[PDB]
Design a protein around this ligand. Structure first.
Ligand SMILES: CC[C@H](CO)Nc1nc(NCc2ccc(-c3ccccn3)cc2)c2ncn(C(C)C)c2n1
Lengths: 248, 826, 333
């Protein structure tokens, strides 16, 4: 009925970009660059967190079917955000996305947009819709993170720190292929698991079953701890490369 | 941007209603006859009927009743139009000046309501205290007949019984009572209610409800000293009056449906009844004078007088003379005699008034190579079946050809000096197993005859078991001589086969001129027909030979000769057949995007398809590809009745709500979508039901270019026998005539003070739009019949522009010569 | 695979003809050349358009792939015009939204006055329309465009709700600023006429009330050319909007601007007295002025009129044809 939008870590070694001579580190760099571009363009435009995530998901899904060598990452990123606006009912004129794109990009970076920046983006919409197979409805970890945290009952301050920190990890997991590997319900639980381990919080105590150690099962059944640890490890590798450690 | 003119050539001849009273003066006995939009007034004389005045209304006459209120020296008339325009009129003559004063008027339409199945019913209280109108189901409107009620203000009383069959006001009651027959799940019943004007509501009826016959069709209020009511059914006539109850079921009445009644004697002793077979009976109420003094009703009796035309309404005048107002056939004045003639009949036909009746189909032909033309119509139904040859003369000459059976389609074959006419006769199921005809008709009385010997439908293994007395239609193709109108041949079709379409033409490279018929296998079980035939016949040496037959999976509603090929419509499909060198039809292409393709008209490679519900479509045969192509469609749901192509870009269509409309090709190449949209540009509430559109005219057209600048001519036949004409106008001609209409309305005093703009405004139960791109030719032609001072009032300060001529303020002689020019088109 | 959309070409459908002019493109009747099924195709032209693919087609795609119900139209797949030259820039094609083909729209049936609905036909129709609508409202979707031409009905007697081009999501938690100009004027509720922009799903219930009364009269109950004239019609029947019956009416913008001629009393039960008590009560509740006092889609399904209506007994609404009216005369008078 609906297409499958999930892959193994092993499969990512065979994306079109990879097999076109691009190495793994470079495709990962282009995915962070592209995601942070969509995020910063749409943040400047004053768009909802769901509209930004929807655009990033379309972007990540697109470079599963196409090569970064053949499709300039920033032109595709502008296109994703343009379509995501219409999908999430927060539309923005293409001229404004272009205007913001030139403001955030340098001269070399904006060269990708060619002579007619609007046309370059509009034209690509046909391929983007075909690539995403017209499966426009997208769910994000945010909604699930909020639904599960709402069901926790305990110290409002400690629960708030967990939610606030887990929200940040969702914003970082956007730069990664985690969206292409696990369902938002799994990612939402994984960021709660990560925020909890850093805060030294026993999340089971705030649930309807304070005696049930694997608390997450009452939100997502059939999710083994090792899957949560893999998602946690991948999120922490973003902080390990540079600074930002794991604050508060 | 469409500009058309529409004028009446023959007024509607069918009688819809007729009342008698003392309308012109207290002494004169009058007879008023309403023929759709027209109203005729006559004075009854010993010789017959003397005409005294005829008027037109801006509405279809639905109710018409005379009544004498308290204080009036003579009767006043009440009329209600189909568009709900109520009005009380008065006849007033001053020497020679005959006028119809509008004493009271107003529109009685309710904001919310469901129109009733049995139509509008209007009845007046014997004491003349109120006009009872049944417009909507579950509501009974009451206009109090008061001195101060000039606007005709009314209130609705809630009615418990939703489905009402008929209602009348009873005589001899202390309070104004209504008596009605209604229907519910438990069957049909008769009930009564008292109507309190003071309290504005119904009260308990004087007598109990009673369960009546399943087909109780009419209520008859009986005058004093009997009171109560008679209920006419299919098999029984019953009298109800509280405790009293009589019921007679004479076998004579069961064989045909009684359709109308009338009171002969004022006391209510004798009553005339008329049924679908024309048969006219007398229902006599046998009295029994009690010792009390009162006279109780002992028994009811029926007596067959004779045969008349299939009456819509009977109305006896005086003496043996009765006026038989017929809608299907010719109306009559018949003399009832106390002694039966040698045939056993007490009726003697005195005078016959022509009624072009339901004009189901027609064709324009030049029988004498004159260049004027003649219209041969398929008019009437049942024993009233006939052909009418109308020719211009200043009166129309009409020659009738009685067929004594229903005609369906006509067409002319010049090669054979004769017409082909499809016709249906009713035979009933007899004890022999087969069927038998009630009377002999055109098809049975043919010089030479044949029966289709096709084995296309074979055994059919179809359970069609039939009981006795059931009616069945028998379809035939009649071959009638173009000069004597003698039935040369009659070919009867297969059992349960209905002939729907007929064409005369040569096809392909075949030099013979064939008569092709399209049929449908009509079984009661089938919702829509699943089988049919396209039969090709050739008339030669006084006999029809079957040339070829092509089976189809549906009804063949319409056929047309299309560039040597045969274009036919089978249910939802529009097919184009080719005539092979093997004398056989072989399909070329199809178009299946239709609900039900009923009407076809072609102009070159274009085809105009009239659908059942999706209005009209413009198809085109692409010769290069050998298939059809949808040029543009009218996206307005319109239930059609007939279609016609005026020209390459303009297409006239007639609707079931008595409306006319014209669509034009958008002719704007900015997009492919707008090009495919047919825009309704002309709209006009005709007021008639158009069955057929036909290109031609009866006017003598000379060798050169003569007559009015109105180019084109399309005659049309209607259900009420009215014949009209449509023609196109130039832009300057239309704007001039449109301004004339506005000026004309401001001076012409209408009957019932009905707005002309309202009347011609396009109307269906859902939408009501103002008429556009259409000129009421009857309003324009009436300019000549007004006084000189009113003519000069109309022309005062009238400017025209962009007609290759200056401002020139039109004057009386300018418009009198232009209107006289427009009358010469019919 | 079946999940992969937009890849298959439109040439795999044999077009039968144009059936209507849609919101963003034409609608064609067509047959699948492989399976022989009949389908309806909505053309979505993006080449002549600015801001590419239209938001109206995006809404209809996003919402209909999420909604699956017997009384809501089915979008089967999406197909494209023949690709050419191998350059997507030069490609100025158009997509087509493939749908289930329906035999009619309520508009055409009522307009051509070719149908008659008994109490049992209205019961069957309304139970489907309300069941379909209740599914949408439970998924937090406003239709916002309910009208006769948007209620498809096939010969089976099945009803399907369609044209989700104006449909939007609704967030009950807190309030979202929407568009004031929604639904055609005849089926528009009073709150939108008086300027409400943060409205509820009760707007669709008003449209369905307008439809209910209309099935009993064969005519739209409120027909006016302008907002003020429309509010006058609604006021003549439902009563003038006033704080006595609608306390929050004073909060709307055009409350003082759009005042009816008089302070009318409610006459809905009086005027529609010819309707069976069960349906008259349903109509009375659906055409309630204050949207906070107007019934929900779920409540209409648990009403004396519809609750007991059997799901299995579809009762197809008889459309008389062929032998009907082609030659009426005294036999059919
Ligand atoms: C909303 C746009 C359109 C306007 O009428 N709605 C309409 N009608 C349909 N089918 C009922 C119908 C109506 C008219 C015709 C028709 C048939 C012949 C000529 C002209 N129109 C055929 C089917 C139909 N089927 C599937 N869909 C989906 C929405 C694509 C349909 N949408």
């Amino acid at each position: 009925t609906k297409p499958c939008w999930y892959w193994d870590k092993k499969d990512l070694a065979h994306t079109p970009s990879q097999l076109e001579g691009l190495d793994p580190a470079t495709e990962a760099r282009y995915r962070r660059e592209g995601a942070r571009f969509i995020f910063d363009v749409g943040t400047r435009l004053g768009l909802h967190y769901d509209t930004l995530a929807t655009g990033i998901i379309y972007f990540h899904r697109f470079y599963m079917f196409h090569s970064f060598k053949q499709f300039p990452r920033y032109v595709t990123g502008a296109c994703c955000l343009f379509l995501a606006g219409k999908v999430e009912e927060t539309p923005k004129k293409c001229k404004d996305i272009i205007k913001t794109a030139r403001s955030l990009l340098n001269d070399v970076q904006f060269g990708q947009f060619g002579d007619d920046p609007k046309e370059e983006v509009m034209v690509l919409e046909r391929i983007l819709l075909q690539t995403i197979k017209f499966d426009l409805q997208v769910e994000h970890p945010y909604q699930f993170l909020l639904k599960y945290a709402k069901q926790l009952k305990g110290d409002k301050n400690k629960i708030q720190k967990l939610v606030q920190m887990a929200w940040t990890f969702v914003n970082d997991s956007l730069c990664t292929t985690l969206s292409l590997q696990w369902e938002p319900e799994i990612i939402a639980v994984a960021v709660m698991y990560l925020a909890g381990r850093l805060c030294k919080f026993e999340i089971q105590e705030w649930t309807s079953k304070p005696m049930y150690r694997r608390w997450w099962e009452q939100f997502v059944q059939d999710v083994p701890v090792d899957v949560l640890e893999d998602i946690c490890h991948q999120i922490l590798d973003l902080y390990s490369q540079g600074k930002q450690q794991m604050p508060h | 941007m469409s500009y058309n003119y529409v004028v009446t050539a023959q007024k509607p001849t069918a009688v819809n209603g007729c009342v008698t009273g003392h309308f012109t003066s207290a002494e004169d006995l009058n007879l008023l006859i309403a023929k759709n939009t027209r109203l005729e007034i006559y004075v009854v004389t010993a010789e017959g009927l003397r005409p005294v005045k005829e008027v037109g209304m801006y509405g279809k006459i639905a109710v018409m009743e005379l009544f004498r209120p308290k204080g009036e020296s003579k009767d006043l008339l009440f009329i209600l139009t189909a568009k709900y325009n109520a009005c009380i009129l008065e006849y007033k003559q001053s020497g020679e000046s005959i006028d119809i004063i509008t004493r009271a008027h107003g529109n009685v339409q309710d904001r919310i309501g469901r129109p009733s199945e049995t139509g509008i019913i209007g009845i007046i209280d014997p004491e003349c205290r109120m006009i009872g109108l049944r417009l909507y189901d579950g509501l009974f409107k009451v206009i109090p007949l008061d001195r101060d009620n000039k606007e005709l203000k009314a209130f609705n009383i809630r009615l418990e019984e939703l489905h009402v069959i008929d209602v009348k006001f009873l005589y001899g009651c202390q309070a104004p009572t209504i008596c009605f027959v209604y229907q519910d799940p438990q069957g049909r019943h008769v009930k009564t209610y008292e109507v309190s004007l003071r309290e504005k509501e119904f009260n308990k009826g004087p007598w109990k409800q009673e369960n009546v016959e399943a087909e109780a069709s009419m209520v008859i209020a009986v005058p004093e000293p009997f009171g109560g009511a008679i209920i006419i059914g299919q098999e029984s006539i019953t009298y109800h009056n509280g405790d009293k109850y009589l019921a007679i079921a004479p076998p004579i009445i069961k064989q045909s449906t009684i359709v109308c009644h009338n009171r002969v004697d004022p006391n209510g002793s004798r009553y005339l009844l008329g049924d679908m077979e024309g048969r006219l009976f007398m229902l006599l109420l046998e009295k029994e004078e009690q010792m009390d003094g009162t006279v109780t009703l002992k028994d009811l009796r029926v007596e067959l007088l004779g045969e008349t035309s299939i009456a819509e309404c009977l109305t006896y005048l005086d003496n043996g003379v009765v006026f038989v107002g017929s809608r299907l056939g010719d109306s009559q004045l018949v003399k009832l005699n106390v002694d039966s003639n040698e045939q056993g009949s007490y009726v003697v036909a005195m005078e016959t008034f022509t009624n072009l009746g339901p004009i189901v189909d027609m064709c324009v032909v030049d029988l004498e190579r004159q260049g004027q033309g003649q219209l041969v119509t398929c008019s009437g139904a049942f024993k009233e079946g006939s052909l009418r040859i109308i020719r211009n003369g200043q009166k129309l000459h009409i020659r009738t050809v009685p067929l004594y059976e229903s005609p369906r389609k006509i067409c002319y074959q010049e090669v054979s000096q004769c017409f082909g006419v499809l016709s249906s006769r009713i035979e009933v199921q007899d004890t022999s197993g087969g069927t038998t005809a009630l009377r002999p008709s055109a098809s049975t009385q043919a010089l030479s005859s044949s029966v289709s010997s096709s084995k296309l439908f074979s055994s059919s293994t179809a359970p069609h078991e039939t009981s006795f007395g059931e009616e069945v239609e028998v379809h035939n193709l009649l071959i009638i001589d173009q000069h004597t109108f003698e039935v040369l041949h009659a070919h009867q079709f297969l059992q349960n086969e209905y002939a729907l379409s007929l064409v005369s033409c040569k096809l392909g490279k075949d030099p013979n001129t064939y008569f092709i018929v399209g049929t449908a296998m009509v079984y009661p079980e089938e919702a829509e027909p699943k089988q049919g035939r396209i039969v090709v016949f050739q008339y030669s040496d006084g006999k029809l030979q079957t040339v070829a037959e092509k089976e189809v999976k549906g009804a063949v509603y319409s056929m047309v000769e299309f560039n040597g090929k045969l274009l036919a419509s089978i249910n939802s499909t529009v097919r184009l057949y080719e005539w092979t060198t093997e004398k056989e039809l072989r399909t070329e292409c199809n178009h299946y995007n239709n609900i039900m393709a009923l009407y076809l008209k072609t102009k070159g490679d274009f085809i105009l398809v009239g659908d059942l519900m999706r209005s009209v479509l413009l198809l085109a045969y692409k010769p290069m590809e050998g298939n059809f192509e949808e040029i543009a469609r009218d996206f307005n749901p319109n239930w059609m009745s007939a279609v016609e192509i005026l020209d390459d870009d303009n297409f006239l269509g007639a609707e079931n709500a008595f409306n006319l409309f014209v669509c034009q090709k958008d002719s704007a190449a900015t997009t492919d979508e707008e090009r495919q949209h047919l825009q309704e540009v002309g709209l006009f509430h005709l007021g008639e039901f158009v069955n057929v559109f036909c290109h031609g005219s009866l006017v003598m057209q000379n060798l050169g270019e003569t007559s009015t600048p109105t180019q084109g001519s399309v005659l049309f036949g209607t259900v009420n026998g009215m014949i009209g004409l449509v023609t196109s106008l130039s832009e300057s001609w239309y704007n001039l005539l449109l301004d004339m209409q506005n000026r004309l309305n401001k001076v012409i005093k209408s009957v019932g003070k009905i707005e002309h703009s309202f009347w011609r405004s396009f109307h269906t139960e859902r939408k009501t739009e103002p008429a556009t791109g259409f000129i009421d030719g009857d309003l324009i032609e009436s300019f000549l019949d007004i006084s000189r001072p009113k003519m000069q009032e109309v022309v005062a300060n009238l400017q025209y522009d962009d007609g290759s001529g200056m401002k020139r303020e039109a004057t009386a002689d300018d418009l009198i010569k232009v209107v006289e020019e427009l009358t010469r088109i019919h | 695979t079946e999940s992969d959309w937009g890849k298959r070409c439109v040439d795999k459908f044999d077009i039968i003809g144009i059936i209507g002019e849609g919101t963003y493109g034409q609608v064609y009747k067509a047959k699948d050349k492989d399976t022989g099924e009949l389908v309806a195709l909505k053309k979505v032209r993006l080449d002549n358009e600015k801001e590419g693919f239209p938001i109206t087609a995006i809404r209809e795609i996003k919402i209909l792939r999420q909604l699956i119900h017997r009384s809501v139209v089915n979008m089967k797949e999406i197909v494209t015009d023949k690709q050419d030259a191998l350059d997507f820039k030069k490609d100025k094609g158009a997509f087509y939204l493939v749908f289930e083909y329906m035999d009619h729209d309520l508009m055409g049936l009522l307009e051509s006055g070719l149908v008659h609905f008994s109490e049992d036909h209205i019961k069957s129709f309304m139970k489907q329309l309300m069941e379909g609508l209740e599914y949408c409202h439970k998924k937090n979707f406003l239709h916002r465009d309910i009208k006769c031409s948007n209620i498809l009905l096939n010969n089976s007697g099945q009803i399907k709700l369609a044209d989700f081009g104006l449909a939007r999501l609704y967030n009950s938690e807190e309030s979202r600023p929407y568009t004031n100009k929604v639904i055609t004027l005849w089926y528009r509720p009073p709150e939108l006429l008086l300027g409400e922009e943060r409205y509820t799903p009760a707007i669709d219930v008003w449209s369905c009330g307008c439809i209910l009364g209309e099935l009993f009269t064969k005519k739209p109950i409120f027909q006016a050319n302008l907002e003020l004239a429309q509010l006058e019609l609604i006021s003549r029947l439902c009563g003038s909007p006033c704080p006595a019956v609608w306390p929050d009416v004073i909060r709307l913008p055009y409350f003082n601007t759009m005042k009816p001629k008089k302070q009318y009393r409610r006459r809905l039960r009086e005027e529609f007295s010819f309707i069976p008590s069960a349906a008259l009560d349903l109509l009375d509740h659906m055409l309630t002025l204050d949207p906070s006092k107007r019934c929900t889609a779920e409540q209409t399904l648990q009403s004396d009129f519809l609750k007991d209506v059997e799901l299995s007994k579809m009762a197809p609404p008889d459309l008389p044809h062929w032998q009907d009216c082609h030659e009426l005369w005294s036999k059919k008078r």
